[PDB]
CSV table of C-alpha atoms and ligand atoms in Angstrom, one decimal:
chain,number,residue,atom,x,y,z
A,681,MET,CA,2.5,1.6,12.1
A,682,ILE,CA,1.0,4.1,9.3
A,683,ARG,CA,3.1,7.1,9.0
A,684,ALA,CA,2.1,8.2,5.5
A,685,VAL,CA,-1.3,9.5,3.6
A,686,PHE,CA,-0.8,9.5,-0.1
A,687,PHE,CA,-3.8,10.8,-2.5
A,688,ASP,CA,-4.6,10.5,-5.7
A,689,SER,CA,-5.4,13.9,-8.0
A,690,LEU,CA,-8.3,13.7,-10.4
A,691,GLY,CA,-11.5,12.1,-9.1
A,692,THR,CA,-10.3,12.2,-5.4
A,693,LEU,CA,-9.7,15.9,-4.8
A,694,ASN,CA,-11.1,18.1,-7.7
A,695,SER,CA,-14.5,17.6,-8.4
A,696,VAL,CA,-15.3,15.2,-12.1
A,697,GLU,CA,-18.6,17.7,-11.8
A,698,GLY,CA,-16.0,20.6,-12.0
A,699,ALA,CA,-13.6,19.2,-14.7
A,700,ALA,CA,-16.0,17.9,-16.9
A,701,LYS,CA,-17.3,21.8,-16.7
A,702,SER,CA,-13.9,23.1,-17.8
A,703,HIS,CA,-13.4,20.7,-20.2
A,704,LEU,CA,-16.8,21.6,-22.2
A,705,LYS,CA,-15.7,25.3,-22.1
A,706,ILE,CA,-12.4,23.9,-23.7
A,707,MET,CA,-14.0,22.8,-26.6
A,708,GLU,CA,-16.2,25.6,-26.9
A,709,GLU,CA,-13.2,27.9,-26.6
A,710,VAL,CA,-11.3,25.7,-29.3
A,711,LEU,CA,-14.5,26.3,-31.2
A,712,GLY,CA,-17.0,29.3,-30.8
A,713,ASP,CA,-19.0,30.1,-34.7
A,714,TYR,CA,-17.3,26.5,-36.3
A,715,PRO,CA,-20.2,24.6,-36.7
A,716,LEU,CA,-19.5,21.7,-34.6
A,717,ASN,CA,-21.8,21.1,-31.5
A,718,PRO,CA,-18.7,21.5,-28.9
A,719,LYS,CA,-20.8,18.4,-26.5
A,720,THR,CA,-20.1,16.3,-29.3
A,721,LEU,CA,-16.3,17.3,-29.8
A,722,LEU,CA,-15.4,16.4,-26.2
A,723,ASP,CA,-17.1,13.2,-26.1
A,724,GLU,CA,-14.6,11.8,-29.3
A,725,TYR,CA,-12.2,14.1,-27.3
A,726,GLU,CA,-13.1,11.4,-23.9
A,727,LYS,CA,-12.8,8.8,-25.9
A,728,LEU,CA,-9.9,9.0,-27.6
A,729,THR,CA,-8.0,10.1,-24.6
A,730,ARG,CA,-9.5,7.3,-22.7
A,731,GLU,CA,-8.0,4.9,-25.1
A,732,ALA,CA,-4.6,6.6,-24.6
A,733,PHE,CA,-4.4,6.6,-21.2
A,734,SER,CA,-5.1,3.0,-21.3
A,735,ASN,CA,-2.3,2.4,-23.3
A,736,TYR,CA,-0.1,3.9,-21.8
A,737,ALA,CA,-0.8,2.5,-18.4
A,738,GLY,CA,1.8,1.3,-16.4
A,739,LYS,CA,3.9,1.9,-19.3
A,740,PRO,CA,7.4,3.9,-19.6
A,741,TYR,CA,6.2,8.2,-19.3
A,742,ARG,CA,5.9,10.2,-21.9
A,743,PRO,CA,4.7,14.1,-21.9
A,744,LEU,CA,0.7,14.0,-21.7
A,745,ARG,CA,1.3,17.6,-23.5
A,746,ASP,CA,2.0,15.6,-26.5
A,747,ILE,CA,-0.6,12.9,-26.5
A,748,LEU,CA,-3.3,14.9,-25.6
A,749,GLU,CA,-1.8,16.8,-28.6
A,750,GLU,CA,-2.2,14.4,-31.0
A,751,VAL,CA,-5.7,13.6,-30.1
A,752,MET,CA,-6.4,17.1,-30.4
A,753,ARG,CA,-5.3,17.7,-33.7
A,754,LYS,CA,-6.8,14.1,-35.1
A,755,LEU,CA,-9.9,15.4,-34.2
A,756,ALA,CA,-9.4,19.4,-36.0
A,757,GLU,CA,-8.3,17.1,-39.2
A,758,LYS,CA,-11.6,14.8,-38.4
A,759,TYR,CA,-13.8,17.9,-38.3
A,760,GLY,CA,-12.3,20.5,-40.4
A,761,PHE,CA,-11.8,23.2,-37.6
A,762,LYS,CA,-8.7,25.5,-37.1
A,763,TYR,CA,-6.0,23.6,-34.8
A,764,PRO,CA,-5.4,25.8,-31.6
A,765,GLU,CA,-1.8,26.2,-30.9
A,766,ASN,CA,-2.6,27.3,-27.8
A,767,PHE,CA,-4.5,24.3,-26.7
A,768,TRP,CA,-2.2,23.4,-23.7
A,769,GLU,CA,-2.4,27.0,-22.8
A,770,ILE,CA,-6.3,27.5,-23.0
A,771,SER,CA,-6.4,23.9,-21.2
A,772,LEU,CA,-4.9,25.5,-18.2
A,773,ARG,CA,-6.3,28.5,-18.2
A,774,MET,CA,-10.3,26.6,-18.3
A,775,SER,CA,-8.9,24.8,-15.3
A,776,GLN,CA,-8.2,27.0,-12.4
A,777,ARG,CA,-11.9,28.7,-13.5
A,778,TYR,CA,-14.0,26.3,-13.0
A,779,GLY,CA,-11.7,23.1,-11.1
A,780,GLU,CA,-12.8,22.7,-7.7
A,781,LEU,CA,-11.6,20.7,-4.8
A,782,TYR,CA,-14.4,18.4,-3.0
A,783,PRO,CA,-16.2,19.9,0.3
A,784,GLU,CA,-14.1,18.1,3.1
A,785,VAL,CA,-10.5,17.8,1.3
A,786,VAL,CA,-8.7,20.9,2.9
A,787,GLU,CA,-10.6,19.5,6.2
A,788,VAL,CA,-9.4,16.2,5.7
A,789,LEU,CA,-5.6,17.5,4.5
A,790,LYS,CA,-5.2,19.6,7.8
A,791,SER,CA,-5.7,16.8,10.0
A,792,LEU,CA,-4.0,14.1,8.1
A,793,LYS,CA,-1.3,17.1,8.1
A,794,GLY,CA,1.2,17.6,10.8
A,795,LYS,CA,0.5,14.0,12.6
A,796,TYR,CA,1.1,12.3,9.1
A,797,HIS,CA,2.9,12.7,6.0
A,798,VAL,CA,1.0,13.9,3.4
A,799,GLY,CA,2.0,13.1,-0.6
A,800,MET,CA,0.4,13.0,-3.7
A,801,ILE,CA,0.6,10.7,-6.9
A,802,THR,CA,-0.5,11.7,-9.8
A,803,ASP,CA,0.4,10.6,-13.2
A,804,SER,CA,0.8,14.1,-14.8
A,805,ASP,CA,3.2,15.7,-16.0
A,806,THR,CA,5.0,17.6,-13.3
A,807,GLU,CA,4.7,21.3,-14.5
A,808,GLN,CA,1.0,20.7,-14.8
A,809,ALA,CA,0.6,19.4,-11.7
A,810,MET,CA,2.1,22.1,-9.7
A,811,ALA,CA,-0.1,25.0,-11.9
A,812,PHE,CA,-3.0,22.5,-10.8
A,813,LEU,CA,-2.2,22.6,-7.2
A,814,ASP,CA,-1.5,26.4,-7.2
A,815,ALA,CA,-5.0,26.9,-8.6
A,816,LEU,CA,-6.8,25.6,-6.3
A,817,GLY,CA,-4.3,26.9,-3.1
A,818,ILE,CA,-3.9,23.6,-1.7
A,819,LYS,CA,0.3,23.5,-3.0
A,820,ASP,CA,1.4,24.0,1.2
A,821,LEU,CA,-0.9,21.1,2.2
A,822,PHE,CA,1.1,18.5,0.9
A,823,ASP,CA,4.8,17.0,2.3
A,824,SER,CA,5.6,15.8,-1.6
A,825,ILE,CA,4.1,15.8,-4.7
A,826,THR,CA,5.7,12.5,-6.9
A,827,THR,CA,5.1,12.3,-10.7
A,828,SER,CA,4.6,9.9,-13.6
A,829,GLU,CA,7.6,12.5,-14.9
A,830,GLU,CA,9.5,11.9,-11.9
A,831,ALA,CA,8.7,8.0,-11.4
A,832,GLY,CA,9.6,7.3,-15.4
A,833,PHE,CA,6.6,5.3,-15.3
A,834,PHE,CA,2.6,5.5,-15.5
A,835,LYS,CA,0.4,4.2,-12.6
A,836,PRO,CA,0.1,1.2,-11.7
A,837,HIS,CA,3.9,0.8,-12.4
A,838,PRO,CA,5.7,0.0,-9.4
A,839,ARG,CA,8.1,2.7,-9.9
A,840,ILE,CA,6.0,5.9,-8.9
A,841,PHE,CA,4.9,4.6,-6.0
A,842,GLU,CA,8.7,3.2,-4.6
A,843,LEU,CA,9.6,6.6,-5.0
A,844,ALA,CA,7.0,8.3,-2.8
A,845,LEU,CA,7.9,6.1,-0.6
A,846,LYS,CA,11.3,7.4,-1.1
A,847,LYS,CA,10.7,10.6,-0.5
A,848,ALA,CA,8.9,10.1,2.3
A,849,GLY,CA,11.2,7.9,3.8
A,850,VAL,CA,8.8,5.0,5.1
A,851,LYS,CA,8.3,1.3,3.7
A,852,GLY,CA,5.2,0.5,2.0
A,853,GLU,CA,3.4,-1.1,4.7
A,854,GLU,CA,3.7,2.4,7.0
A,855,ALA,CA,2.2,3.8,4.1
A,856,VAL,CA,-1.5,4.3,3.0
A,857,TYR,CA,-2.6,5.0,-0.6
A,858,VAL,CA,-6.7,6.5,-1.4
A,859,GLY,CA,-7.6,7.0,-4.9
A,860,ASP,CA,-10.4,6.4,-7.0
A,861,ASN,CA,-9.3,3.5,-9.5
A,862,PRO,CA,-9.5,0.1,-8.3
A,863,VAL,CA,-6.7,-1.3,-10.7
A,864,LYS,CA,-4.5,1.9,-11.3
A,865,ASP,CA,-5.1,3.0,-7.3
A,866,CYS,CA,-5.1,-0.2,-5.2
A,867,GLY,CA,-3.9,-2.2,-7.4
A,868,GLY,CA,-0.7,-0.6,-7.9
A,869,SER,CA,-0.3,0.3,-4.2
A,870,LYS,CA,-0.8,-3.2,-3.3
A,871,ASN,CA,2.3,-4.2,-5.0
A,872,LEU,CA,3.9,-2.2,-2.7
A,873,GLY,CA,3.0,-3.4,0.5
A,874,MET,CA,0.8,0.1,1.0
A,875,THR,CA,-2.6,-0.1,2.5
A,876,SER,CA,-5.3,0.7,-0.2
A,877,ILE,CA,-8.4,2.7,0.2
A,878,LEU,CA,-10.8,3.1,-2.9
A,879,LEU,CA,-12.3,6.4,-3.1
A,880,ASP,CA,-16.2,6.0,-4.6
A,881,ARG,CA,-18.7,8.7,-3.6
A,882,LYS,CA,-21.2,7.6,-6.1
A,883,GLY,CA,-21.4,4.0,-4.9
A,884,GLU,CA,-20.8,2.5,-8.4
A,885,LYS,CA,-17.3,0.4,-8.1
A,886,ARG,CA,-19.0,-1.7,-5.8
A,887,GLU,CA,-18.2,-4.3,-8.8
A,888,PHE,CA,-14.8,-3.2,-7.7
A,889,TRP,CA,-14.7,-3.2,-4.1
A,890,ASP,CA,-12.7,-6.5,-3.7
A,891,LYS,CA,-9.7,-5.2,-5.4
A,892,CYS,CA,-8.6,-2.8,-2.1
A,893,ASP,CA,-8.8,-3.1,1.2
A,894,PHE,CA,-10.8,-0.4,2.2
A,895,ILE,CA,-13.7,1.7,0.6
A,896,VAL,CA,-15.0,5.2,1.2
A,897,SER,CA,-17.3,7.6,-0.4
A,898,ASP,CA,-16.0,10.9,1.6
A,899,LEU,CA,-12.7,11.7,2.8
A,900,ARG,CA,-13.7,12.0,5.8
A,901,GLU,CA,-13.6,8.5,6.3
A,902,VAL,CA,-9.7,8.3,6.2
A,903,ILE,CA,-8.8,9.8,8.7
A,904,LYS,CA,-11.0,7.1,10.7
A,905,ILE,CA,-9.6,4.0,8.9
A,906,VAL,CA,-6.2,5.2,9.7
A,907,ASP,CA,-6.0,5.6,13.6
A,908,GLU,CA,-8.2,2.0,13.3
A,909,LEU,CA,-5.1,0.9,12.1
A,910,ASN,CA,-3.0,2.2,14.2
B,2288,LIG,MG1,-8.3,8.7,-10.9
């Protein structure tokens, strides 16, 4: 039976309308006064990271700090603004301020907790992951936090799911994984036997609904699915 429920972080629990805001303010901070539109830097930044996250998918871990910094240095040299050494520090500050949870998050974690092992599986560095959960105040709502730094590999590599299943002591078939990336989340968890639930609040990922077992648009639908399976 289902004795565990695992969630992704970005795009699943934190409001993308909140991450987007934070990132804009990060770039505004880095610039300010400099004759470059902050929104233009943001879009170029997102393009570069997207490519970096694409190139490391399912491969050996490498500090996200070094990756994201190679990108900013690239952009600073390209546009001529001062590379902020405290880029990593400024990033966190803006997250803790403008980053927020989707409305039903606490509600859902509470229900699943107690009766089912509740864990997190993220590609983020371990320290970044802790500070983040601590900022949104949901650290103690999890029984386990599993990261790529700990597994040595990024999603969808199987090792990051295996490790989370071990920390829990359950078998893949006895576990569920909730995420918003059809291939990285659902495709990855699937290789371990886990039951996959794709979150798609905007109803856009219709094109990739088949790669997943279930499709929800509100995390409250997960408690339903679980019991239905038990
Ligand atoms: Mg995601």
